[PDB]
Amino acid sequence: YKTGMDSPAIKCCGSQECTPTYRPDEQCKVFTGVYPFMWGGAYCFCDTENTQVSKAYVMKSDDCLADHAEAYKAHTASVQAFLNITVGEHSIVTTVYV
Amino acid sequence: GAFGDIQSRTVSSSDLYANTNLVLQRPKAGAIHVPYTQAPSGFEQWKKD
Amino acid sequence: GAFGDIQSRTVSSSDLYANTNLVLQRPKAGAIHVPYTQAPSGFEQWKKD
Amino acid sequence: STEELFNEYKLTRPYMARCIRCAVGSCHSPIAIEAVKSDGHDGYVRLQTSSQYGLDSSGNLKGRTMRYDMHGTIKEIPLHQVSLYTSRPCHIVDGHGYFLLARCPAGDSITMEFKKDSVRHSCSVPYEVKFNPVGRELYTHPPEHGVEQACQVYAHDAQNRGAYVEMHLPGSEVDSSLVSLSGSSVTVTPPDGTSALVECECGGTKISETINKTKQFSQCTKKEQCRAYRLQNDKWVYNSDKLPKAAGATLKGKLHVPFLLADGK
Amino acid sequence: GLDSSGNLKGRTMRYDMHGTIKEIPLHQVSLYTSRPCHIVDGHGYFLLARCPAGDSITMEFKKDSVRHSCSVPYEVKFNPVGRELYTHPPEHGVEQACQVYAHDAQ
Amino acid sequence: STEELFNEYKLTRPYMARCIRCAVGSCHSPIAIEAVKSDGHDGYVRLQTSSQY
Numbered sequence A: 001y002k003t004g005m006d007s008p009a010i011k012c013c014g015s016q017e018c019t020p021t022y023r024p025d026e027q028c029k030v031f032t033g034v035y036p037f038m039w040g041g042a043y044c045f046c047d048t049e050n051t052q053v054s055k056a057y058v059m060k061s062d063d064c065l066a067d068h069a070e071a072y073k074a075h076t077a078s079v080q081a082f083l084n085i086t087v088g089e090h091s092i093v094t095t096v097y098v
Numbered sequence B, C: 001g002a003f004g005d006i007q008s009r010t011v012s013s014s015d016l017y018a019n020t021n022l023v024l025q026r027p028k029a030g031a032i033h034v035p036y037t038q039a040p041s042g043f044e045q046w047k048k049d
Numbered sequence D: 001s002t003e004e005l006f007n008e009y010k011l012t013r014p015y016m017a018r019c020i021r022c023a024v025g026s027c028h029s030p031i032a033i034e035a036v037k038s039d040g041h042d043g044y045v046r047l048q049t050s051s052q053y054g055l056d057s058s059g060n061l062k063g064r065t066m067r068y069d070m071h072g073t074i075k076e077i078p079l080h081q082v083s084l085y086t087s088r089p090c091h092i093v094d095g096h097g098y099f100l101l102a103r104c105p106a107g108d109s110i111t112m113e114f115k116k117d118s119v120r121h122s123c124s125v126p127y128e129v130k131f132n133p134v135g136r137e138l139y140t141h142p143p144e145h146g147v148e149q150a151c152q153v154y155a156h157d158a159q160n161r162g163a164y165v166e167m168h169l170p171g172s173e174v175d176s177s178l179v180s181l182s183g184s185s186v187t188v189t190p191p192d193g194t195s196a197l198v199e200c201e202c203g204g205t206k207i208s209e210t211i212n213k214t215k216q217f218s219q220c221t222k223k224e225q226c227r228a229y230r231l232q233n234d235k236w237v238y239n240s241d242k243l244p245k246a247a248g249a250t251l252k253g254k255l256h257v258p259f260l261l262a263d264g265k
Numbered sequence E: 001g002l003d004s005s006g007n008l009k010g011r012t013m014r015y016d017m018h019g020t021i022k023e024i025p026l027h028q029v030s031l032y033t034s035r036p037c038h039i040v041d042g043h044g045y046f047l048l049a050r051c052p053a054g055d056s057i058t059m060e061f062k063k064d065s066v067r068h069s070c071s072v073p074y075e076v077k078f079n080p081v082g083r084e085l086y087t088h089p090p091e092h093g094v095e096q097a098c099q100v101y102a103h104d105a106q
Numbered sequence F: 001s002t003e004e005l006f007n008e009y010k011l012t013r014p015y016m017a018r019c020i021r022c023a024v025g026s027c028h029s030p031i032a033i034e035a036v037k038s039d040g041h042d043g044y045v046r047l048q049t050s051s052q053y
């Protein structure tokens, strides 16, 4: 499975709340008192009122189509056979259900 | 952590049930990311077994 | 796989007895080589012991 | 090959991401790696990076170069110039857009060294490399000869059949380099054809586009008071862990992924 | 941290050859271990670098034609922090008190 | 020193050999190695390759 995390949502100099959406095992969290820092300086210049909206869920792996394990419900086995029968100098090869 | 952490009725089926004990932690100060912790892939653990 | 897999009456003696269970396998398609599998050097094994 | 490359490159927007190890302390490295997959039996690793591969900076099919960006400036490098390593040095197979394919041996961590003209910056990630052999005969390295079994390795084909990623409109990027200190004012000059959403912190906070021309910022003389938010949005960007989420940009788009794992012998 | 003439130049490495004092840029010369290291900064005799775990310490100095390196059989103890044994610093997680050599020139 | 080098080099004929790992897939590489001997006590290895030295 591939973990799916969205881009963090920051309410700079403000408050924000997580929106409950529907994803496999989706989790949303709100983080306050966060001072994000970027390459081009600090993203938010307020100390408080920085709510961080983080949502993460689970996605099936990209290669799940090719590589995967399959569970089956097994019961009531059928029996088959290949018989190479020769009766009266008649060499006969065929399949006969058991 | 065991088999069945990801269950799909069909390979192409979009619907799937996920149970990986996914929980987030506090993001580190000065960084933007999604800090998450969860059990290892149950299918992967079964394969290692 | 044991001491004496190669036996020579003398250091400079040309004659030597070789018993290494040397068996050839199928060469890989598209490649030219000698695909051989044999036991490790019994002399080397005794040295390791 | 042209179709998927064009699909990925019309809305690529290469970026720089936070990296734990920039070969000096910690920084945001353009070569930062966000995900590595090491499930290939032979040892091939399929990973996606901030930098793009397979095309130049002009959106033309050019697979021999690696395309990245620095501080909003898109730059490109020859693929052979930049190499990654592990516990042992690796070998790069090919790259396709965000995702990259290479032959790495077993390792505890992934690092790619980008040596520019004078500045050599590299990013390391503490992701283990699972080098799982094939069959019950545990080899630390592929043998020269022998019998063959069914094997699953990340094929280098660029076909993208049943997997994709979501690309959104990138969020606003802060750029304090654009902040200039003028006489009793700040002259944030946006670059050519660029909207710099200027945010100023003083009495009476103001937000302005100033897309074409810079604006004098009264009551906000000091440079640190005003923060410049570069806003280009030329192309969509991959939904990355390091990028801010633009709330007003719900611009999800599927981007079919290359280097899908395929069965073989 | 200084040139061959005793001037503050932290970006270069200074040495000597047969009594002839010569200098090289710091980035030019690198050391490695079981895995290649990363050099943080140098200060006179003492040098600070980011080396992963290794059994021996070796620095390769390649001049114009002569490449000379010295390897010493000194172990590199990559001792983790806390009760969670990690072979490489994690990307995220909780923080503890850690003792590391600060790069300050004090 | 000249004698043995000349004896080897009068009939050298360097070649390229099939290599399992050519840094891309598999190919025939001019630098391919056929044998490595690793009995050196200090760690020194004497090996023969297609290329000459």
Ligand SMILES: *[C@@H]1O[C@H](CO)[C@@H](O)[C@H](O)[C@H]1NC(C)=O
Pocket (backbone or CB within 6 Å): A084, A086, A091, A093
């Ligand atoms: C079936 O039996 C006949 C008669 O013994 C024999 O010639 C033939 O090869 C057999 N077929 C197979 C598939 O063994």
Ligand SMILES: *[C@@H]1O[C@H](CO)[C@@H](O)[C@H](O)[C@H]1NC(C)=O
Pocket (backbone or CB within 6 Å): D209, D210, D211, D212
């Ligand atoms: C900036 O110039 C563009 C023309 O490219 C125009 O559409 C826009 O209105 C101008 N902005 C302002 C604030 O006048």
